[model samples]
Target chain A: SLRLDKFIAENVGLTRSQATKAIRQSAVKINGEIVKSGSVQISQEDEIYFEDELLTWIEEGQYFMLNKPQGCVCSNDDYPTIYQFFDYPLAGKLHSAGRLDVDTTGLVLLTDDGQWSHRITSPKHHCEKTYLVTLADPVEENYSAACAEGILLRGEKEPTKPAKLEILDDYNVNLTISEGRYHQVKRMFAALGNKVVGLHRWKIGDVVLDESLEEGEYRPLTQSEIEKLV
Target chain B: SLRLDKFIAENVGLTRSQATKAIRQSAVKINGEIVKSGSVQISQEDEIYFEDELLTWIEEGQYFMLNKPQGCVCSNDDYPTIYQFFDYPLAGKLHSAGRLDVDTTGLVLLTDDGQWSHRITSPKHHCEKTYLVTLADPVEENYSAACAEGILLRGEKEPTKPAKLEILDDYNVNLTISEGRYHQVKRMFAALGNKVVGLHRWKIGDVVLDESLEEGEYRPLTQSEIEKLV
Candidate 1:
């Protein structure tokens, strides 16, 4: 059992002053009775209410991984954005853990919690992102070895980080990169004088987009799943 | 697409006169405009309105197959009726395909389609219903053979039709009977000197209660599922 105002203020990252204001504005209640004063004590048996709705305390933050389909933008401005795919009210609070170009589609982590997002996106984290790349032309036999040896690009002072590449088919290869830069996958292939026809990230860290999920659908990450990512 | 009177008359097997009366009293309208006369012409492009609300033409009646858990009554007249489980307007229209004892919990179909209900419930059709039975005592090894061989019950001149029974466990068995007479399964077990402690019908014809569905929850039967039942 916990006080309604204290619970709401702590979980939602709201200040005590804001929580008091919300209660005074008649946004908080206990079992359908409006509690205008934040001083009102509540027990777990009593259903606490906030913003004219019932409030249940969730111990964990919401987390989900989406297979961003091609042709979708990651931004959430007036233009089509990745957040538009999710109907959850917290969609506006979410940002991509790692950016994907408009044409790039694959595993994208979306979350509102700042700590979890940073854990996955920070360059210092060295999180490996896997991609299935289809090239315009066939890759040479030495391509895998060359990628592992690291290739120098036009602007970089040093060679790109050692990458893992395996030929999946005639024109398709699976590649894993630890560093995320603007169009990093495409630019890496370009550095070797190759063109990427299609680029899709298949995995982020250990999380894989389940095949059962439709093109634009996602499910909440389980506690075990989040723990694995961390 | 059709006029309100025509749609109701065709679907419900009512006469044109009765349909007209129902339409007028219900305050039938088309596209927000009141239609006082039953002869009002309308097309599919025009949205049909009824009783101050836009009418959605549900060509296929919504189907719900519930696994009526024990302690619930089949009829809406009694306490704990299944009708209370649904929302207002839907509860008013939902009718049971057949009845089950208050203690019986298993597959029961609810629909607004009168014709479909008749086809399934009519004694002449002899729809096969499968049940999982738990007896008070361990059934004899020859129980399946005895049931399949047919048994003479009290108050009936003819022996009951041979039913399919398979021993599931020491005390549990699966049985399929075509003739659903009053307390038929219980009586059949009584004829063999066995007490029926628990009974749950799992299927009717090819329409098995989907194992994926949780207890008491229902879903619309797909077209393929409907075809299997017929």
Candidate 2:
């Protein structure tokens, strides 16, 4: 059990001070009794009420995903972090399992599960990551063949793992790779004398970006959704 | 060769619009000529000038990382993506190798090298990611053991991969995990009936957070630093 003030704020995504004001105004209830002090202690077993409504969104399970926006850094103090979008308590312990670049937006994993984080990022475990790449030129036959054969990138001695490149349009290709090489897709296309004008990672493992999410929005991963990765 | 506006912005960490503004004011030069147009094209052989000084930061090749401050999402338009922190041209194509949550602040790989990002984020690549964890309680041996044995989080069908835990202080510990699961760290400790109050990811693979960076700062990875990952 943590402090009642903290618990209330965390449960409802308030600043501890904000929750305290609500307590002083007698807007909170614990065990069906109005509790007017922020110093009290509370727990999950306790039935707490906020503004005549039971605080139900609090959870022992803390898993969520965000559609990473371009300019928001995955950080706390520089600009506003995504936590500003959430008031959930786990936002403190929550972090991304794997990340996207500022230029790309899609599904991002944020949780406090250490082992689970390891699973998503561990190179030993192969999870297919897919990207929608917009190139500087039309789809060339040799480019597809090169990506299929694991193109020889500029700086690396070893060729990249072969990529699954599907032509989406005249200039856009859906590129999928099993590994996260630094700028792997763009560099691959660059080595072949092409440029990636626009890029986005739409899927990882078997999970795809929820097209419904607005550019800077997020949501919790559903139970079945979480199961797909494992 | 690239657009002069993009080249200056990318080399010096200016937003494209900002670079354009600087150019329109005749503050930018190309080939020792005070060029006042954003539409001008530039090349490596051209001597581009900015702010009355020759542009020396224009990298022939681009690879970088940022110290992501907590509070921003990785997006193009949210609050200024990590790219906003960079003035480099390839910042357009630069993506994170692996991403962090908005609550996290640390070394984030941003590069035009797609292969490097794929390698870094790929589960097949073996690299250690380290975090500094601040708990709501003192460290416990069983917690370490549980982490090493793999944590069984709530609502999951299986246990998570094992993680490494190192004690740093009463309320602080260093935790490392290879996989990126949904809230893997906190859920692991939560399963152990402990609470994680604060956390920061400090290292990934062999790369650690650059001590030189402030909350929202970024810098290019040196030639040798880039070699370490590949």
Candidate 3:
């Protein structure tokens, strides 16, 4: 059994407050009867309707990995939201655990579980994210050492967490950082008196980007991949 | 004339809600009359008393730089607060712009102006902080390049922002990082497979720790120093 508000939030992706507001407006029906109270308990056997459509209890939180492309934002706005790519019933509830800038591309994990996302995003947890960075300048001999020590982005107050730098070529490198900051990969290069010509995230935590996932394509995370994150 | 709540908060350092709460409890008296409403207007010429203590409106916000010592927490608790050292009337309202861990020691800026502090602490501003780090192991040749590139701390999801490293010797170096992470100086060293034996911050933004001030001592920010930060 779960509270009505919890049920709505879990299945429909409405926040608890939004769910309660919908219930107060007589938009939610339980067992074919309108219930105004959000605290009311309903089991999986109970029929629920939000608006004209039937709502079913989802037993588990959904997880997916998207090969994000350029020109899409993580959140809703005038630009296309990452949610537009998903066809899931609870797509509205799903949020990216780690966000990438619209200009950047690569692996983005989407999850409905706030706690699961927090584990990957929270600074205390220090989840690792790998980016394949394309720079305008030739790779300097000292770039790896500097990255391993830490880079101080231009406008940030704290230095970035330690990063692992693997040089793929003079202009391309695979850099893995443990903390995410806004425009971190690009900013890191800029701080080095270099510019990031192109940026793409290939991995997060231990999960590598699925080679089969084309740009803007998505797929459900394997049971093992989801389990490894939390 | 100014709002009573604003006067109270500006003078005594109480938050708007706390000022209102105190007024509701009839804890405030203006011109020998109890004021029950926070919206009541008053001038600096009006005599204000809070719990029998005369309150005077301070025309300018207070700013100070404290050379913090080891063992003092940035916040209030059973452990000694940074406020204990200040004998000012609105000491309760004064807060450290940037915080240090209980075990770490360095320069801490105290101010009553929330806006000014926000400028120093906010990520958009990218204030620089310099630290004198003593390490357990000798500095390596690759350390500078690694730090410049950015080091990915173990638990963090992003690499550190770009940092400037100056080697004083094998075991001691000056590290200037743009961002302040939890135990960042120590953690930055730890991420490099080295441990920080001692850490001290000597500068924030453009303000250097006053060489004359001993540990636990503080002085008001010079007019030029205060002007430089914002």
Candidate 4:
């Protein structure tokens, strides 16, 4: 059970003071009876009304994918954060499950569900992140073999878990790494003596950036898509 | 041959106008004969004098190694640049041969010799840099093999030229890599799912950070050490 004032404020999007005022004015009701006292206890079984309007609590969490554009940070700071694109209740609680650098463009999963996020962000889960990389030089003959065995990132102690590499051309390749070391994809090729001129992450595990969505656009994940992360 | 005023100023550390004044005052001489005109040309073989004191031009360039400390940038910026440690004439012409990140510490070569710097900085020179690394995780079983076979850094198109990995302990290792890719040592371990907590460059080619020197101290390289690069 929760305080009547708090329950009304939480569900109807009112401040606690506003809910208390409504209760004092006899505008709040429980089970069709005007409850004037803000201290009255409330249960989920009790029906709530605000100003004679029935109140139903919206769901508590959200999950979606954004076709993140470049120059938008995952967290709030000097640059505009991806959160600016979200227009939904309880957005304050939402965060990007797998953050992308401000210059990196790609599919990003946003969610308020902590457990769900762990499935992607936790290193032990080994969630696969795939990127379409453009290089300054032609790909080397040994890149495939090197990545398959594992590549060492600068400053890191262990080699990255084996990655899958698919060459698109002389200067472009598709890279899929299970671990998310900082700038992993870029550092890998740099260790090989090449530079990553452009990077676009297209896939995370089974979830791919929706081709239908333009950059900066977003959509709620389908039930099957959300379950795939688990 | 160089003009009298220019030569006087270049050798005596006076401005051109000051040198001209000294020349006009009959205080400047070449071969014991007073030269009143600033336009008089003099050859290197000429015995030059200023104010009856024999003048000899100082050397044109410098080369030294500094045991760099943390929070010192390689180039001029908001933070103090390594150049601050030098109090020598012609310092403006000097640049770091191989730069260490502001947070990284240990040996740094400073010189005004561009060609000599290339021997250490150029990728094709295959100069070896040895780092003492303290890691956040134990060295991996495959780290040596991965480095020996050439590990791929995150963004490069080619694999690193093979590196030598020597494990000192679970969290410490000595790594020698010929290629100086950005943050190569740190990235190598990061790819292996470890973090480099400390990084110190102790050796570049055959020149090592002198053990007798303390952090932030510097000394001129011995003749043998300088010749090792060539």
Ranking of all candidate structures by their DockQ, best first: 4, 2, 3, 1
Global lDDT of each candidate: 0.67, 0.65, 0.74, 0.73
For residues B1-230, could you state the per-residue lDDT of candidate 4 as single tens digits? 88988877765556789778667554665765555688987776776665433444443556789999998877622469887887755444466777888889999987655446645665557789999999988887767866776654434434567789999998899999887666777777765557999999999998889988888788988878888975
TM-score of each: 0.38, 0.39, 0.42, 0.45
lDDT for predicted candidate 4 compared with the true structure? 0.73
Taking the tens digit of each residue's C-alpha lDDT, what string does model 1 give over B1-230? 55667864664445788557545443345564445467776675565532222333453476788878888887544459766677887775566666678899888887766556645655556778899999998888767765675654432323567789999898999999887554778977865668899998889888888887666777777777665665
lDDT-best of 1 and 2: 1
Clashes of each: 0, 79, 55, 37
Off by over 4 Å in 3: A1-230, B1-59
All candidates: interface RMSD: 38.1, 20.9, 22.0, 28.9
The prediction achieving the highest TM-score against the true structure is 4
**Model 2, A111-189: lDDT tens per residue?**
6553455467545566778888888888776566666766543323345676788887889898888766556677777
Ranking by TM-score: 4, 3, 2, 1
Residue-by-residue lDDT tens digits, candidate 3, A1-230: 98998887666666677667656544567776656678999997787765423454643677899999998888633589787897755564466787787889999998766557756876667889999999998988778866876654433434566789999998999999887665677767865668998999988889999999999899999999999897
Ranked candidates, highest lDDT first: 3, 4, 1, 2
For model 4, how does the per-residue alpha-carbon lDDT over A1-230 read when each residue is reduced to its tens digit?
A: 88889887776556777567556544566876656678888886676655333444433557798898988888633689887887654344565667788888989988756456645765546889999999999998778876886554434434567899999999999999887665777778866668988889889889888999999889999988898887
Q: Second chain TM-score per prediction?
A: 0.73, 0.68, 0.74, 0.72
Best by DockQ: 4
- Candidate scoring better on TM-score of 2 and 3: 3
Better of 1 and 3 by lDDT: 3
lDDT per residue, candidate 3, B73-104, as tens digits?
77632268777888756675566677776767
